[PDB]
Amino acid sequence: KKAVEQGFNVKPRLNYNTVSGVNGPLVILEKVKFPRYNEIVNLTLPDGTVRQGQVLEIRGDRAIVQVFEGTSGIDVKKTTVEFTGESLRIPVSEDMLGRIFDGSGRPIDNGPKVFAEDYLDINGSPINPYARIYPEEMISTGVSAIDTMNSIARGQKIPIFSASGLPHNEIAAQICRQAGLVRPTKDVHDGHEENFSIVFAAMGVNLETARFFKQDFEENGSLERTSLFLNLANDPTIERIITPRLALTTAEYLAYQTERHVLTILTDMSSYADALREVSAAREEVPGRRGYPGYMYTDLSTIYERAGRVEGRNGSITQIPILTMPNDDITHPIPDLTGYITEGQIFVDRQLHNKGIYPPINVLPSLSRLMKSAIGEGMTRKDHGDVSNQLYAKYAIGKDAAAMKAVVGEEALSIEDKLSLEFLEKFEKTFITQGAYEDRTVFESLDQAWSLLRIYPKEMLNRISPKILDEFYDR
Amino acid sequence: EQKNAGGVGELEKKAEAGVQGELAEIKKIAEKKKDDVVKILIETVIKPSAEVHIN
Amino acid sequence: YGAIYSVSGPVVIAENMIGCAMYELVKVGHDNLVGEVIRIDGDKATIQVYEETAGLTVGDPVLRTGKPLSVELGPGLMETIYDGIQRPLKAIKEESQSIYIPRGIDTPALDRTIKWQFTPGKFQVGDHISGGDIYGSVFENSLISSHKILLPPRSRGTITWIAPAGEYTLDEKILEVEFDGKKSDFTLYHTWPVRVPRPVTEKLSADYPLLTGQRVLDALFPCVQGGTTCIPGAFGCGKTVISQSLSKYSNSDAIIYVGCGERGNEMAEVLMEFPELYTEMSGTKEPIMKRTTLVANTSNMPVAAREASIYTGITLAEYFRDQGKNVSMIADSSSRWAEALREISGRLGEMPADQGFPAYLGAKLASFYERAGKAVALGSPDRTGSVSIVAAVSPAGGDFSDPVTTATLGITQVFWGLDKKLAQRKHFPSINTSVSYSKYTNVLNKFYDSNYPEFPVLRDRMKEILSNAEELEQVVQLVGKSALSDSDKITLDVATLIKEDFLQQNGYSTYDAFCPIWKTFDMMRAFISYHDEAQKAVANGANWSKLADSTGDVKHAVSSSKFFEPSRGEKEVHGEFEKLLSTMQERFAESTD
């Protein structure tokens, strides 16, 4: 039975017109009864404007409230603040799919407030080490740059590294509109009870880009499978911190209670890190390396580990955090910690973007740390791993031969390098180059990779076993 | 393009049919359980609990 | 007793808490969260609560346990899985039936319900007993036949009552001693402060080799049971074979595996692989879990648990050392423990010494690694145990220059340099001979001269021939293949044969899953003799090419020497190796004509 009858209990939420002073985005209350660490408030401006905020510090009769969207016009004689029961909790339900939410969880579409099934704590819980299992399937993103190579396992935490001006948002939108299980393609359209869902979180997202996300997912079938979140740049930044927490709470609920396969996409983790910096400096806290808080490792670990397959429950969480390199450097704290926590990464290259190729995934520096589990016979197709390895090797050979083009001349190269230049041109122009609205299924991507790898004779395909060559080369 | 525009009315009709189908069940459930929900809420609000949060 | 005064993150101040010690653990709040005292100001004590404190209320009673961070030592901690602070994760899941760990859970570290068969020792009523004296043994499992229970090292007195033979639970008292009039009750288990090293009568010099079975490190870079070892914990380097060989084929009578701060996926892989891993003695009939206890911590756990993981592991290892059982402790990642220390210091606001690390990191590592070593156990009878530490290091950037790895390399006597490139080329166990080293070679000279006298000279001869071939590889790439002399090509081919058939070990194959020390020494003899015979014959004979092409059968024989089944018996294998060497000598004599 559902032991939710405790929700009918009513608790006295108090109102305090006892603001002693205002200091930045913080307001301080002297007389608040029986302090406990974190709560949620709804304070009203003297002109009646209702504003929301959080609780930061607790000591003997000590309470400090960090008001959302600043503390402009807050006085000490008229403002009143209402203390809700406990910390932030998202109204979560199965029919949350197809809804668009603000960073605070309030829907921004024309639909009503979500009809809650339960209010879930936002922080989460520590998964027992005795109850974890390995990611052992494949999530097809429809992007051949990510399917044939850099395959994403069903539970893998793999980021997408990009820079400020590059179209990482477009790649995220394409992945969200095209993501799905390979099994319906593999099971001959027999498998449908393995429902697939997507949780898309936008953090610090620009107003035009947020509008693009909303309009694009609305105008496609992605929304029906997607629970969507936005957080504008001019929106409160602690809402930007809340947004990934809300997204991962929704994804965890769906996957580990409704037994769905959920793909979680987090956009612009750099904006989230900036919000972390701002909130950490809001309290009198010493800054860390490059100004970021010293515990950013732990916070990113908490966000990222809310992923993967678990013992018992049939669902899964696949996470694709997307972040912008502040100075195109790996050594920056955000990409460094993201690589240290996640599995592999996907690189969106600046030069590859300037050369007019989309989607500009740079294959060489990008790896998927759990690609082996996504590859198999029943899993995807048999030749997948060998084709990926051969493509990577041929692309690297083409790349360094193209580098040598300007040192030894074209005529000084071997037939290896001639075929490699031809392969690189056709590769970066037809295989990596994929239409923004073009959905290559994994088998279509493998077929294209074969038709492009058929340039070389079977002798020159070293990275692929002859057992596969005798099966797939001749078609 | 005209054939695509031909289904605009059909798609709207299907959406309205689905909305009405869901709304029928929603209204039926609300009518059936509104009295019970109101009674439970009134009982919860009118009956307070006295306790000391020291323990 | 106490009462919560102020909370801020993981630190809690408790008022009217007079009479609490320095590092005395306490039960914080109604949830009874465990927390460690770190500062005292009169009655106000600063508590570092382990779990989340978002629910604590100012005024919640806090009860002081009276003891520091102590691990429960006794029967029932074998085959069990623990966290850093020894919480029985298996029992945690069974009692709660919950996916996550419940906050404030207090399941006993040792199963209080299991009835243990107890046979009393030689000590009788009225006798004088001191710390470490075996006053009985408990049949724990089929592999740990006799779990010698000990009087706690700090306790002593005159025995006034002993429970007779029978079955008892860990809550049952089985020993009464009298000291200065007051009585004391002793059950099958006793708690020991985790950070103080468990005392021994005398710490000897570790001289018996820690035979793992991996030929490359058993021969080239040996380790002594009671020594300290450092290995890279980097991704895909193949440390799994090292961990499984130490926990599967080593001389150790018990295995301690600690996961400091390893990622969740990797810890899951370890926790699934270890139960399905079987022993070697008596012909692979028992699981190594009966011999192994684990300390498991995922990426996100209480930071204090991650910091205390290695201390709990080494305390369990010392507890089993005091029973006379040679144990070996494997650390999943010392770098993760260093990160836990760094985050603890950052929370406490301590001064960063080197790259954000605390100033005591080197001292902490030195003390922890000095906790290991062969030692005469405290108390009677006179038994000798040993603790050996194989700690893995994994720098974040891989530069191998952060202070933790430098301190570990300075302290640890043997370093097994697993390499990315060798694992990429499917060469296993992927130990980079050029960078690896062992300072226990000189110590093991006594054991070698007692058992295999020819071993050290064979070992360093192989060392120098591989070094010579490594440098002549660069020479070849510089000048050309034809510029080599005949002896140079002999060295090159001998080194390649070594790399293919001695250093490389399949591990999964039955013939080389466990290479014993005598088989290792016989292969040493075979390969070194091959090199020496080729060198001498070419020096005083014809060209090398004809001899090598003609003597390829002997090379194939010494290659197949890797395939000799150790299960045939040590005497049979030694005799067959003697036959191989005899045929080798005869056939080289025939060829040199």
From Swiss-Prot, chain B:
Q: Where in the cell is it found?
A: Vacuole membrane
Going by the entry's taxonomy, the superkingdom of the source organism is recorded as Eukaryota
| Disulphide connectivity of cysteines | none
- What this chain does, per the record? Subunit of the V1 complex of vacuolar(H+)-ATPase (V-ATPase), a multisubunit enzyme composed of a peripheral complex (V1) that hydrolyzes ATP and a membrane integral complex (V0) that translocates protons. V-ATPase is responsible for acidifying and maintaining the pH of intracellular compartments.
Q: Which family does it belong to?
A: Belongs to the V-ATPase G subunit family.
- Misc remark for this entry? Present with 2280 molecules/cell in log phase SD medium.
Assembly and partners are described as: V-ATPase is a heteromultimeric enzyme composed of a peripheral catalytic V1 complex (components A to H) attached to an integral membrane V0 proton pore complex (components: a, c, c', c'', d, e, f and VOA1).
Q: What is the protein name stated in its UniProt record?
A: V-type proton ATPase subunit G
Q: What is the lineage of its organism?
A: Eukaryota, Fungi, Dikarya, Ascomycota, Saccharomycotina
Q: Which gene encodes it?
A: VMA10
- State which stretch of the full-length protein is shown: 58 to 112 of 114
